[PDB]
């Protein structure tokens, strides 16, 4: 039935209407053969290097750790074309599409960053691109909508349901069930029905591969912990994958705590949600006691996904990775600290990861520890958000 296990332990699966299974089966098969095709890997690595900017730097923070025994490195995915790690995987999914003979791309977006990444890969490679967006998210992110239009993509608003990302994930799928002969669904994170949690990890894993080689070159030892924020899980599993077998390396994923776990307004399904079945997978999720699916909350729109990739749920259950949460305020403070001490404006999403590293360092300043934070994007997109809060406070 499938070439690969669709499950990570008890999490994962292919919970889709029957009509979508041939699309998933066709996609798994093309992915398996692309993975064995040197020509595909060469074209992929070519685009990553000559178009997207890989490999990205690994920056040692000079000032931020002063007065402690923490050495902090930032994997600089903010330096990637597009400003975020999303670019890696959409270039891969678009080559996959062409390899299948598809001519059209479908995607869902909320904050707009996945829409922009999908529109740029689609323009580069000659694919027609249509993007679904929750109308609430549409006008809240009209800069990103204009970007997508500039790159030629068609943007389609969703008012159904709460008119957010999760209601965008639904209308793209109905489109695909009718159009999958000619069109490819470019899912935006390491979640959803199999083979997508597998495909996105493999198209993001160069982050951890590069980090490993760069850290060995610079410090001659593996890090004590690598730390990444966890919205859907793609940037974190891309950092984690190459270290999973180096059991001396801590894996730390950072879910958004929003206004605080105890307030119920967060986006931390992995540690504070409950297993259910939605969006084609069995996974922890934000749900009511009746089993309806709630929204995440986080000050960073990019961590708005009310579930989490199934491989993260698996790694937690076996204790290979640890998952924590960081509140809005903690992430804001980390944002300000990185600008003032290193001259780097991080995405508010990435700021959650940094904010946890700063906690590890500050709670135990005499502990010698080598930490890598995946800086999953830059924060230009967030200066307006951070500005309004700061003057609303003083």
């Amino acid at each position: 039935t499938t070439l690969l296990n669709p499950y990570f332990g008890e999490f994962g699966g292919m919970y889709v209407p029957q009509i979508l299974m041939p699309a998933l089966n066709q996609l798994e098969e093309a992915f398996v053969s692309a993975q064995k095709d040197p020509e595909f890997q060469a074209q992929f690595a070519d685009l990553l290097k000559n178009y997207a900017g890989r490999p990205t730097a690994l920056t040692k923070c000079q000032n931020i750790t002063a007065g402690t025994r923490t050495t902090l490195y930032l994997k600089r995915e903010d330096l990637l074309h597009g400003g975020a790690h999303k670019t890696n995987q959409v270039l891969g999914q678009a080559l996959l599409a062409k390899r299948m003979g598809k001519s059209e791309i479908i995607a869902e977006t909320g904050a707009g960053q996945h829409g922009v990444a999908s529109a740029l890969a689609s323009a580069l490679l000659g694919l027609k691109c249509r993007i679904y967006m929750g109308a609430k998210d549409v006008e809240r992110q009209s800069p990103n909508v204009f970007r997508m239009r500039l790159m030629g993509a068609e943007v389609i608003p969703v008012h159904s349901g709460s008119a957010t990302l999760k209601d965008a994930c639904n209308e793209a799928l109905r489109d695909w069930s009718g159009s999958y002969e000619t069109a490819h669904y470019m899912l935006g994170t390491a979640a959803g029905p199999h083979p997508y949690p597998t495909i996105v990890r493999e198209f993001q894993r160069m982050i951890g591969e590069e980090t490993k080689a760069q850290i060995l070159d610079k410090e001659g030892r593996l890090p004590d912990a690598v730390i990444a924020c966890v919205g859907g899980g793609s940037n974190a599993i891309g950092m984690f994958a190459d270290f999973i077998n180096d059991t001396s390396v801590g894996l730390i994923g950072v879910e958004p705590g929003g206004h605080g776990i105890e307030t119920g307004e967060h986006g931390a399904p992995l540690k504070h949600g409950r297993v259910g079945i939605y969006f084609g997978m069995k996974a922890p999720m934000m749900q009511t006691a009746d089993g309806q699916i709630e929204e995440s909350y986080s000050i960073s729109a990019g961590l708005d996904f009310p579930s989490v990739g199934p491989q993260h749920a698996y790694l937690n259950s076996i204790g290979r990775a640890d998952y924590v949460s960081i509140t809005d305020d903690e992430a804001l403070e980390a944002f300000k600290t990185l600008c003032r001490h290193e001259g780097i404006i991080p995405a508010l999403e990435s700021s959650h990861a940094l904010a946890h590293a700063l906690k590890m360092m500050r709670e135990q300043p005499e502990k010698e520890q080598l930490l890598v934070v995946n800086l999953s994007g830059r924060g230009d997109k967030d200066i307006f958000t951070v500005h309004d809060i700061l003057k609303a406070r003083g």
């Binding site: 292919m14 029957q18 009509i19 109905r174 939605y278 969006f279 749900q287 309806q292």
Partner: protein, 256 residues
């Protein structure tokens, strides 16, 4: 209880196909929904397909998406739906009742516990829209243990292995979506599948007559009924009269 077999037995001695409306429970309110269902039954519906409002129905078009929202606006919950189900069954002991569920509502309080509650209120079948046959093992096993028939959709892009599986695992009836129809009907009859109900775009009497002629045991009106409810939201007595008109027209079409 085997209401489907009895229904299909009497329908065949009377050379009729089945007409099966779909409706969302609690749309547009709880009490209007119960009057709608009583109207559908008395206008000649042979069985009922009932949906439980779910937040994220990725397998449903816009007409149903709005029905769900109307029901949520009315405060409808799964617990209230099961209460409604017991009332309906109390008034109409012989009509078969199938639920259209989404997996999370079945998974929520335990899969066995869900199918136990169906049997307790006298539900006859359950279709889980987002559980393909490949994933269905825990669901259909729980259904069989509680004398619930598991319903599977047979889609237009079905290959032979799918039909074999659908024929072995399903009971009650086969949910047909639109390779030629008569060939699909025949392969299913070859493999001893449950009787096939055609459920794609059934809006007019002539389509009901086509499906029976093509060899299907009947037709499900997947959304044409929800649009009569949407069209007539402001005048409830108009809504019922047009529901009565439509249903009896569609059910007359099934007597070939």
């Amino acid at each position: 209880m085997e209401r489907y077999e009895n229904l299909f037995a009497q329908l065949n001695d009377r050379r009729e196909g089945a007409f099966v409306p779909f409706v969302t429970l609690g749309d547009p309110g709880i009490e209007q929904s119960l009057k709608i269902i009583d109207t559908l039954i008395d206008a000649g519906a042979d069985a009922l397909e009932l949906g439980v409002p779910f937040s994220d129905p990725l397998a449903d078009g816009p007409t149903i998406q709005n029905a769900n929202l109307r029901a949520f606006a009315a405060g409808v919950t799964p617990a209230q739906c099961f209460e409604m189900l017991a009332l309906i069954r109390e008034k109409h002991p012989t009509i078969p009742i199938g639920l259209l569920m989404y997996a999370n509502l079945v998974f929520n309080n335990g899969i066995d516990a869900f199918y136990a509650r169906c049997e307790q209120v006298g539900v006859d079948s359950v279709l889980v829209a987002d559980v393909p046959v490949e994933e269905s093992a825990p669901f259909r096993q729980a259904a069989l243990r509680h004398n619930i028939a598991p319903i599977f959709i047979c889609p237009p892009n079905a290959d032979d292995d799918l039909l074999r599986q659908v024929a072995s695992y399903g009971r009650g009836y086969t949910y047909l979506l639109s390779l030629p129809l008569h060939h699909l009907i025949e392969k299913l009859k070859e493999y001893h599948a449950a009787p096939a109900l055609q459920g794609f775009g059934i809006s007019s009497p002539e389509q009901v007559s086509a499906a029976v002629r093509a060899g299907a045991a009947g037709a499900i009106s997947g959304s044409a009924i929800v649009k009569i409810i949407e069209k007539n939201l402001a005048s409830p007595k108009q809504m019922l009269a047009e529901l009565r008109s439509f249903v009896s027209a569609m059910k007359a079409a099934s007597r070939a």
